[PDB]
Design a protein around this ligand. Structure first.
Ligand SMILES: [Ca+2]
Ligand SMILES: [Ca+2]
Ligand SMILES: [Ca+2]
Ligand SMILES: [Cl-]
Ligand SMILES: [Zn+2]
Lengths: 255, 256, 256
């Protein structure tokens, strides 16, 4: 079973494909998408409804890859739509760093197809975590020919952040006197405008302040965050005299 | 108009393409880039100056995509270069998550080409945020055959920075005695060397210090930052005695 | 020489490729990887063991690209496996932004191949920092035909991190009385669950505490981290009364 919500990688043209060999360009990996089907006009040939290797041995493969870390949850294979050709068993190989390749599950040989069109699906628990994956047919019927699809987790909503950083201080004696709940606002303009409204984290890196009968009171808050900047509100209360406070900030936009 | 400073996606080989069907490999999406043209020698066929479908109906397309989120600002289409074939109208589809596709602009049919070579450009306002985008020919002259280019915003430099994190303390009594402005430096080494110089944000997560007639004074600064590490300078002044301090740090490396 | 531990980009299918021209589909970029080799059977053509241009001039190229920034450390070229065709000199161009192209080493003409199968390697010092790169044959032997590989630095463990952010407080008087080492835990849930265990940095943004004979004491520690959340353990010791503390936190997810 293909888990609900998963991404069809070839359907969405998310992976580059490279076969070991092709019978010819009209039998190439571009024709390997699961359920691939073309013209039924038998007078002209518009391509095999599969990838088909040229060499017939145990060393053929399609490699599927891209820069990003995919979490593959399953793989589906299928035979050739237009001729009695199919892969009947295959091994999997993969790589997360693109330098070291590993055998999936110690070189597990997986039972594949029995006919032209029936879909056989394999599920990975836990997901294979890879940048490139390769299918390696071991046995076949008539010829090494397949359609297939790879399934991956969708991308997390938090992914691909943009970040801007900086520091901000009171800079003067605004909170160094008076009584009660006291506030002073520093307006921060981000060096560059965000696309979406960031979330902002702050951290104190300087405290110069007087206790009030032994009590220390200071707070920093970010507020009125927009795409262009925000307000760092420096806060004190009781009778505390804050001479200076400094925060670093980290602003993060996603999605 | 193609907006100034845009990225030509197929030109920079930035998108994978997948057609519904190919007339044959010599009419493949590999031959679809705007203005593609090959040998003019009529005696030998080196492929169409177009992508060309095999099936002729309303259901053909090219899908274009990649792991990343594009900000598509425009699209251009053109007919076949070497025969009288072009797409007269098409719809667009796109997807951000690669699970749910949306009809561009509620399924708007866009008037496309009426010759081989004139370029028809469509602007997107606002930009289309998608991982994958598909052109869906609705009407054609003679055959479903086209050349195209997709245009997108350049990558902004504040996106996907690298990060490294860690913690640093005084770890001893260095600032816990003495008078006036007092500093001790902690030389911090990042777990992995960066390829270029990061910035280094810090925040305090431990105070253990004595007041000086009721005044608290401490500070931390990251200085002398390199690809390999930085110095966290712990500071006190007056007659504050600082028993220990701790910072979490976050080193952020941009555009690499 | 190819530096030990480089990534072979074409081998791992990390780049889209686009030629200026193909002799035909059976001579396309898909057949261009270093050492590419097909059936040795002379009674049916299964494609060239090379890419081969259609037009024979000095304006042919393959463009290799993708979304992410690469650091290319070397190129390797080869001639055609199956006929006496090979590139004898070439130039390189690249782009980091996919708007502005630059000429490798001010258009240096690199001496290339001499036969079908010997591999000629060029080292890039420093690495070419590029999203796309293009090989431009200048001279050739019989036909513009080649095989190649591009080598890149492996991705750093620290790249493409994701970040989540929030705040936590004691929010009550738990730490405000008693004596000796006292702790209170706040369980934090991440707005979205992470795919793997993050690291969690914190920095204080509120202190409301009493000194203990002039000594200030407070600490925050992020503990018990999972995909779903963590514990912020607020800490005081000696006889300090902490009325409240607040932290911001930065949760960072690596290698995903
Ligand atoms: Ca057919
Ligand atoms: Ca031609
Ligand atoms: Ca052959
Ligand atoms: Cl404090
Ligand atoms: Zn990518």
């Amino acid at each position: 079973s293909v888990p609900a919500g998963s991404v069809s990688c070839l359907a969405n043209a998310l992976l580059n494909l490279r076969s070991s060999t092709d019978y010819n360009a009209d039998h190439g990996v571009k024709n390997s998408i699961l359920n691939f089907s073309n013209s039924k006009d038998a007078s002209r040939f518009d391509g095999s409804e599969s990838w088909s290797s040229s060499v017939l041995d145990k060393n053929q493969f399609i490699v599927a890859g891209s820069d990003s870390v995919k979490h593959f949850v399953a793989i589906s294979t299928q035979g050739r739509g237009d001729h009695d050709q199919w892969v009947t068993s295959y091994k999997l190989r993969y790589t997360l760093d693109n330098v070291n390749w590993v055998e999936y599950n110690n070189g597990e040989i997986i039972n594949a197809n029995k006919d032209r069109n029936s879909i056989v699906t394999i599920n990975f628990n836990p997901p294979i975590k890879a940048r490139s994956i390769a299918i390696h047919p071991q046995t076949y019927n008539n010829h090494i020919s397949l359609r297939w699809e790879l399934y991956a987790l969708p991308v997390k909503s938090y992914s691909n952040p943009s970040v801007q950083v900086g520091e901000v201080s009171i800079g003067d004696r605004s909170l160094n006197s008076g009584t009660g709940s006291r506030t002073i606002v520093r307006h921060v303009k981000f060096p560059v405008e965000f696309l979406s409204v960031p979330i902002v984290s702050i951290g104190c890196k300087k405290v110069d302040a007087h206790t009030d009968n032994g009590q220390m009171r200071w707070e920093g808050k970010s507020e009125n965050i927009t795409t262009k900047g925000f307000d760092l509100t420096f806060i004190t209360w009781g009778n505390n005299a804050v001479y200076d406070l400094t925060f670093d900030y980290v602003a993060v936009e996603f999605n």
